[PDB]
């Protein structure tokens, strides 16, 4: 949902307060995607054990 997926782009374009808005969207999604990954690995860890 962010304007751009590259951090260097939003930092070299938007204002300091505007970049934080976009950085929030990037961190939020990337945090959820990583949590989903860890969750699935724990599930498969129960299947292998």
């Amino acid at each position: 949902g962010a304007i751009s997926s590259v951090l260097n782009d939003i930092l070299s374009r938007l204002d300091p307060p505007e970049a934080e808005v976009q950085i929030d969207r990037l961190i939020t999604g990337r945090l959820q995607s990583l949590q989903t990954y860890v969750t699935q690995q724990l599930i498969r860890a129960a299947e292998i054990r």
């Binding site: 070299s12 374009r13 938007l14 204002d15 505007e18």
Partner: protein, 48 residues
């Protein structure tokens, strides 16, 4: 673009294409001219 005597009408306007050159945007801040200066796609200070 900026210093032209008379611009084009907003009913029928001529778009100025600028490419293959050096754009110095620090002169705008070095000498205050524009009364209203803002950037939606980027920050006003990051053009340079």
């Amino acid at each position: 673009v900026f210093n032209a005597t008379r611009f084009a009408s907003v009913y029928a306007w001529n778009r100025k294409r600028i490419s293959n050159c050096v754009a110095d945007y620090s002169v705008l801040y070095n000498s205050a001219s524009f009364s209203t200066f803002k950037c939606y796609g980027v920050s006003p200070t990051k053009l340079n």
